[PDB]
C-alpha cells in the first residue's frame with residue numbers, strides 16, 4: 012500500500028460504463044492525479060460488496076502490477092483506493108472500450124459511422140499493441156493472456172494494452188484458459204514466455220482482420236488444444252492484406268525460438284506506421300534506443 016493511494020473524496024463517479032470482472036466499472040473525475048491537470052476524466056474499477064475478500068486482495072494486486080508500467084501504449088494507472096469503502100482503482104479513461112468490442116461494432120451485421128479499418132489503420136493498430144508488448148517484455152514481463160478483449164481503444168483511436176489479469180513476472184485459477192489464444196507450448200507444458208505472447212499477438216491480428224470473430228469456429232477448446240499442438244493454424248481471413256497475413260504466419264512458427272520479437276515486429280512495420288509514432292512510441296524512445 013501507500014503512495015499510489017489517493018483520497019476517496021477526490022474521485023467522483025459520473026455514470027456507469029459496464030460490468031467488469033470484479034465489479035461495475037464507472038467513469039468519473041479525479042482530483043489531482045495528473046501533472047498540470049486540476050481534474051482528469053478517468054475510469055473507476057470497483058469490486059462488488061460480495062467478495063469482501065479472497066478477491067479484494069487479488070484486485071488491488073493486479074493494479075499493483077500496473078504500478079511498474081508507464082508507457083504510452085499501456086493503459087496508465089492513476090491511483091488506487093484500498094483502505095476504505097468500495098475498494099477501487101482509477102486509471103486512464105479509454106472511452107471507446109476494449110478492442111474486441113470496438114471491432115465487433117464496426118461489422119455491418121449490426122448497422123454505422125465508422126468503416127472497417129484500412130490496411131494502414133490496421134498496421135497502426137498492430138504496431139501500437141506491439142509497442143506496448145515490446146515494453147512489457149523489456150521490463151521482464153509476460154502477459155499470458157493477450158487478446159482483443161484485453162486491449163483498450165482511446166477516443167482518438169489509440170489502442171493500448173489495458174488488462175493484466177494473468178500478466179505475471181517471467182520469474183488456483185478460477186476461470187477458463189484462453190485456449191484459442193494460447194501457443195502450442197503454453198497448451199502443452201504450461202509454458203509462458205515473451206514468445207508465447209507473440210503467438211497470441213498473431214491471433215489478435217487475426218481478430219482485427221476478421222473484426223474480432225471467434226478463432227477456430229467449429230472446434231471446441233479441446234479440439235483447438237489438439238489441432239494447434241499438431242501445427243494447426245487459422246486460415247487467411249476473407250480479403251486479408253497479404254501483408255497482415257504474412258505477419259500472422261510469422262508469429263505462429265511452431266518453434267518458439269523462430270518467432271519474431273515484438274521489437275522485431277515493430278521494425279518490420281515501422282516504415283508504415285503513422286508519423287507521430289516516432290515520438291510517443293517506446294520503440295523510438297531513449298529507454299531502448
Ligand SMILES: COc1cc2c(nc1OC)c(-c1cc3c(Cl)ccnc3[nH]1)cn2C
Nearest residue numbers: 028029030031036054103104105106107108
Ligand atoms: C458496457 O460495457 C463497457 C463499455 C465501456 C467500457 N467498459 C465496459 O464494460 C466493462 C469502457 C472502459 C472500461 C475501462 C477499464 Cl476496465 C479501464 C480503463 N478504461 C476503460 N474504459 C468504456 N466503454 C464505452
